[PDB]
Design a protein around this nucleic acid. Structure first.
Ligand SMILES: [Mg+2]
Ligand SMILES: [Mg+2]
Ligand SMILES: [Mg+2]
Ligand SMILES: [Mg+2]
Ligand SMILES: [Mg+2]
Ligand SMILES: [Mg+2]
Ligand SMILES: [Mg+2]
Ligand SMILES: [Mg+2]
Ligand SMILES: [Mg+2]
Ligand SMILES: [Mg+2]
Ligand SMILES: [Mg+2]
Ligand SMILES: [Mg+2]
Ligand SMILES: [Mg+2]
Ligand SMILES: [Mg+2]
Ligand SMILES: [Mg+2]
Ligand SMILES: [Mg+2]
Ligand SMILES: [Mg+2]
Ligand SMILES: [Mg+2]
Ligand SMILES: [Mg+2]
Ligand SMILES: [Mg+2]
Ligand SMILES: [Mg+2]
Ligand SMILES: [Mg+2]
Ligand SMILES: [Mg+2]
Ligand SMILES: [Mg+2]
Ligand SMILES: [Mg+2]
Ligand SMILES: [Mg+2]
Ligand SMILES: [Mg+2]
Ligand SMILES: [Mg+2]
Ligand SMILES: [Mg+2]
Ligand SMILES: [Mg+2]
Ligand SMILES: [Mg+2]
Ligand SMILES: [Mg+2]
Ligand SMILES: [Zn+2]
Lengths: 86, 49, 99, 136, 97, 123
RNA sequence: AGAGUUAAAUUAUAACUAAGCUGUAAAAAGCCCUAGUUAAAAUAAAAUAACCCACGAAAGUGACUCUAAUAAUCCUGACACACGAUAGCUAGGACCCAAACUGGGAUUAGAUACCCCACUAUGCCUAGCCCUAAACCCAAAUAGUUACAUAACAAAACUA
């Protein structure tokens, strides 16, 4: 409100395609976590009920990180197998 | 060593008289701290003017 | 008689030291269509993909140039006691036994 | 480097639409609320040229929520605005609701030309406490 | 009496430890360019470690520095100052694909 | 240097500016302060518009005053700065150069944590 | 623990503009001293950073600045001493927003509830009480060891 307007969260559509530029802006906000925050902040969420969220999120992030790594590590051996029908 | 550093800066301090000088000088020579970084750790300071 | 420790101290596998970015010589002992299984002699063979340049030049028995990345592929993962082995080593293909 | 989005308020940038500076192009406020949408097209001078609501468009208490209604309001809004002769519009969406995209499309399809989207959706930096969550 | 046994020395092949892009740099709240380098252009967000890729101490340092630069008003909150949008980009984010 | 004074001042012409700075350092030298240096950072358009003394300002001049002062004092100078009609925002920070540089030796790599869960032959 | 400060948001209150605005699974009631825009103090609460894991004895503590400042050459120890989330009580201020209660509106066989709408004690400050929690990491303190060893499950087993 004290900041200069139109500098923030602004995309300018190129070659007149609107839908593309909107997708772009959406990708911005969702990349920064603002959509999850708006949606979060429609109602309240109590501090306890918040650390639960945090911890469940962070556990899940750890799991998915690890499992991802493991998958991409074992990726090589997806290759068609040499020894078949030994 | 410390005491001598301060002894050296005591000549450069601003005192009641030098106000007239210093202030007039401060307006004459704007100084920037504005300073940047490169992915290699290198700095690029503001481009020469 | 040679003591084992001596055999160890003077071996090439010791002399090489750390595995990263080493330039190694290797041999192709098995082929599946795009994939060439290369024993450079270390413990485990590595795998490669036949390059576009001179495809038919790389055959079983052919000798090859390798840039050795890792002597073997291993890591420990979430809730694991022992780390996990691929039973291969990581290497890159440079040229074929440039002579 | 073509179409860097955020054109500066300094004059270093010459790009004109209908021979106007980006500062002079009309602002269309879109407000997308879960039960509603409203567009208001205003001059760079802040004199309102067009207003359309999902209700003003003759939908009713629930149905006025939908994206259908949004594009509907958008069209007629751009009609009233086109009547006063605005070619180009820089748009701002306020709130996050069903008729965001629909209404923006509604301005285009309604024959109004869009340059910019910027999102001003109020994001508390932890000011006023929200109302309690619901089932409880 | 076996002179060919191994030696109990430290690892000579030990690789030098990696460095945060600022390791032994100096973060001041005064250079807003620097602090601008770690902020999301559209939001005014502060990027996390997993983006910036900094040590613990340098992240923390940067964060505090920024907040100071915001209240004292050398730097704005809700957008990256346009002057600095054209400067070198440090972080790993891809917005536009 | 011990303390640092960030002066954001109402943008004026030169004489009025000079006046303001002068009387500022006078006030400081009266509360017992030793002034090291004066660094003009220019007149910038503020990042955002600041409202003080019933005036809402767009631009401002920027100044930096390094000085030594006794602990008891800082409040006094802050008060006398807040009172002032042309200060568009004051502040006083412990001068950055008292804070030490403790060498980042680098990243101490964190290994995956083991022996969290018991060894159990489950399923 | 003090003292000073405010970026986002919100609200008074004006200027325009349109008749609606709000609200749900769907509605109704409610409000049009309404709504969108443009201005704007106070009060309250502190996005991102945090994929961090620091500080405190615990409760607790994450906007900014400065002042004061974190017991013990360090074993255990009470019915003694000093603290102790929320809620609550006493007196005085504060009041954006939230909100037990309550009154409307729906739903329902009923609906003293879940959904909707207002509005209050109350959350906020200063001073004084009250001394309770799933105050739980349900895992006492201080030195140790990984020997011996799987009731089950959970955070593996044990000495002194
Ligand atoms: Mg406003
Ligand atoms: Mg998060
Ligand atoms: Mg928060
Ligand atoms: Mg309950
Ligand atoms: Mg198990
Ligand atoms: Mg107090
Ligand atoms: Mg405000
Ligand atoms: Mg307002
Ligand atoms: Mg208002
Ligand atoms: Mg609904
Ligand atoms: Mg009605
Ligand atoms: Mg968070
Ligand atoms: Mg924590
Ligand atoms: Mg202690
Ligand atoms: Mg004791
Ligand atoms: Mg208590
Ligand atoms: Mg209380
Ligand atoms: Mg009240
Ligand atoms: Mg009031
Ligand atoms: Mg209320
Ligand atoms: Mg009732
Ligand atoms: Mg029933
Ligand atoms: Mg239900
Ligand atoms: Mg009220
Ligand atoms: Mg409290
Ligand atoms: Mg607790
Ligand atoms: Mg518990
Ligand atoms: Mg107990
Ligand atoms: Mg005890
Ligand atoms: Mg103790
Ligand atoms: Mg033992
Ligand atoms: Mg059993
Ligand atoms: Zn570092």
């Amino acid at each position: 409100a004290n900041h200069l307007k139109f500098i923030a969260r602004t995309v300018m559509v190129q070659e007149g395609n609107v839908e593309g530029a909107y997708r772009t802006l959406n990708r911005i906000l969702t990349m920064d976590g603002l959509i999850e925050d708006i949606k979060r902040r429609r109602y309240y969420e109590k501090p306890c009920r918040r650390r639960q969220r945090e911890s469940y999120e962070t556990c899940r992030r750890i799991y998915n990180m690890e499992m991802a790594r493991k998958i991409n590590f074992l990726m090589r051996k997806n290759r068609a197998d040499p020894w078949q029908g030994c | 060593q410390e005491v001598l550093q301060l002894q050296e800066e005591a000549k450069t301090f601003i005192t009641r008289e030098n106000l007239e000088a210093r202030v007039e000088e401060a307006l004459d020579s704007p100084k920037s701290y504005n300073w940047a970084i490169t992915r290699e750790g290198l700095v690029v300071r503001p481009q020469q003017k | 008689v040679e003591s084992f420790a001596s055999m160890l101290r003077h071996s090439p596998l010791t002399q090489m030291g750390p595995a990263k970015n080493k330039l190694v010589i290797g041999q192709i002992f098995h082929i599946v269509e795009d994939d060439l299984y290369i024993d450079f002699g270390g413990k485990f063979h590595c795998v490669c993909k036949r390059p576009e340049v001179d495809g038919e030049k790389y055959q079983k028995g052919t000798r090859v140039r390798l840039r050795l990345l890792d002597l073997e592929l291993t890591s420990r993962f979430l809730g694991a006691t022992t780390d996990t082995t691929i039973l291969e080593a990581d290497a890159v293909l440079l040229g074929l036994q440039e002579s | 480097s073509f179409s860097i989005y955020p054109p500066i308020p300094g004059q270093e940038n010459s790009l004109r639409w209908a021979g106007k500076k980006f500062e002079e192009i009309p602002i269309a406020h879109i407000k997308a609320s879960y039960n509603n949408t409203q567009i208001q097209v205003v001059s760079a001078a802040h004199q309102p040229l067009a207003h359309a609501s999902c209700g003003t468009e003759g939908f009713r208490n629930a149905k006025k929520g939908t994206g259908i209604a949004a594009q509907t309001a958008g069209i007629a809004a751009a009609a009233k605005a086109t009547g006063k002769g605005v070619t180009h519009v820089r748009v701002v969406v306020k709130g996050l609701g069903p008729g965001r995209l629909s209404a923006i499309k509604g301005l285009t399809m309604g024959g109004l030309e869009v340059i910019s989207i910027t999102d001003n959706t109020p994001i508390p930096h932890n000011g006023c406490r929200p109302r309690k969550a619901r089932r409880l | 009496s076996n002179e060919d046994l191994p030696v109990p020395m430290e690892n000579p092949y030990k690789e030098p430890l990696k460095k945060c892009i600022l390791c032994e740099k100096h973060v001041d709240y005064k250079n807003v360019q620097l602090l601008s380098q770690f902020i999301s252009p559209f939001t005014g967000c502060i990027y996390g470690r997993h983006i910036t890729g900094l040590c613990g101490k340098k992240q923390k340092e940067i964060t505090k520095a920024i907040k100071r630069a915001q209240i004292l008003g050398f730097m704005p909150v809700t957008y990256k100052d346009p002057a600095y949008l054209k400067d070198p980009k440090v972080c790993n984010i891809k917005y536009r694909e | 240097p011990r303390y640092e004074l960030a002066l954001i001042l109402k943008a004026m012409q030169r004489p009025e500016t000079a006046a303001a700075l002068k009387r500022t350092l006078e006030a400081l030298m009266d509360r017992g302060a030793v002034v090291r240096n004066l660094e003009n950072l220019g007149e910038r358009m503020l990042p955002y518009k600041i409202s003080a003394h019933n005036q809402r300002h767009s631009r401002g001049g920027y100044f930096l005053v390094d000085f030594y002062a006794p602990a008891t004092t800082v409040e006094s100078m802050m008060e006398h700065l807040s009172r002032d009609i042309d200060v568009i925002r004051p502040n006083i920070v412990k001068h950055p150069l008292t804070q030490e540089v403790k060498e980042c030796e680098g990243i101490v790599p964190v290994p995956l944590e083991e022996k969290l869960y018991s060894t159990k032959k489950r399923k």
